[PDB]
Amino acid sequence: YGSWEIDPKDLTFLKELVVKYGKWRGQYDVAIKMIKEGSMSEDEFIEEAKVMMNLSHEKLVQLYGVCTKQRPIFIITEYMANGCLLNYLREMRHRFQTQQLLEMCKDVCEAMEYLESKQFLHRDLAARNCLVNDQGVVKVSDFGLSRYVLKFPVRWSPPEVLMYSKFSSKSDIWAFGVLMWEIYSLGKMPYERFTNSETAEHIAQGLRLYRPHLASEKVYTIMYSCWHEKADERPTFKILLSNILDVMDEES
Numbered sequence: 001y002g003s004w005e006i007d008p009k010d011l012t013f014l015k016e017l018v019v020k021y022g023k024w025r026g027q028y029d030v031a032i033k034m035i036k037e038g039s040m041s042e043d044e045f046i047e048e049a050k051v052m053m054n055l056s057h058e059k060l061v062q063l064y065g066v067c068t069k070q071r072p073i074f075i076i077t078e079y080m081a082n083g084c085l086l087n088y089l090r091e092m093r094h095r096f097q098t099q100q101l102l103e104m105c106k107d108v109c110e111a112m113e114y115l116e117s118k119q120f121l122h123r124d125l126a127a128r129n130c131l132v133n134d135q136g137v138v139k140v141s142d143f144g145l146s147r148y149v150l151k152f153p154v155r156w157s158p159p160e161v162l163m164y165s166k167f168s169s170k171s172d173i174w175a176f177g178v179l180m181w182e183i184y185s186l187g188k189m190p191y192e193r194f195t196n197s198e199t200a201e202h203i204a205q206g207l208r209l210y211r212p213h214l215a216s217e218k219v220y221t222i223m224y225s226c227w228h229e230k231a232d233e234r235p236t237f238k239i240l241l242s243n244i245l246d247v248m249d250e251e252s
């Protein structure tokens with residue numbers, strides 16, 4: 001086994017989350033993703049997994065290794081007991097305060113600032129691809145994984161992606177703004193009354209999402225800044241983080 005390879009004999013399966021919760025060597029909690037035959041460009045993914053092993057940030061779901069000697073192959077990651085952020089936001093029982101919503105934004109922004117510092121694009125950032133752990137901390141998952149998939153996220157894409165397929169750091173910025181909108185809307189579908197086709201037209205005509213009721217003006221300004229028509233006029237993740245911290249200090 002190489003350092004990116006986990007022996008599946010070390011796994012104990014505990015329940016279904018295909019994705020399962022289990023233990024590695026009896027003691028360490030893991031999530032186990034079973035990669036369906038024909039769904040993934042597996043040799044390309046394996047090569048990338050070696051790089052992904054070295055990404056490490058507290059707000060990034062950790063990749064522990066892969067099991068590639070049999071099929072289906074397994075992806076072994078940090079266990080996130082409260083599941084996907086989208087579903088979490090939609091549970092009305094939580095009765096979230098806006099400070100909790102702003103902290104979810106900050107968690108993601110810190111992960112994305114880290115990926116940006118490593119010149120790594122997420123390519124599909126959205127609440128459905130963030131996870132929540134047992135302490136309520138949100139982390140970014142599935143970063144980069146769309147490249148190995150053999151349902152396009154129109155509603156999280158900037159004009160230049162829709163028109164020209166121009167992906168960049170600034171397309172991740174645009175997506176982050178839509179994710180803030182998802183958080184502050186408690187998990188509403190962006191452009192909820194429109195189809196994907198209608199959304200692409202709306203965006204290209206220069207129109208945008210509007211302010212969630214739970215977002216203050218200052219929070220709306222931050223998400224809206226991610227949607228500049230000109231990619232180069234959108235902020236970096238480092239700037240977004242500074243903006244979010246400033247609002248946390250002001251709205252405390």
Ligand SMILES: */C=C\C(=O)N[C@H]1CCN(c2ccc(C(N)=O)c(Nc3ccc(C(=O)NC(C)(C)C)cc3)n2)C1
Binds near residue numbers: 078085
């Ligand atoms: C909103 C999208 C979604 O439902 N995604 C599913 C596909 C991938 N999923 C996934 C991936 C990785 C993990 C992990 N690292 O732990 C998890 N974890 C997970 C999922 C669901 C639940 C759960 O259902 N919790 C409640 C409280 C019963 C709702 C817990 C942990 N999931 C999920």
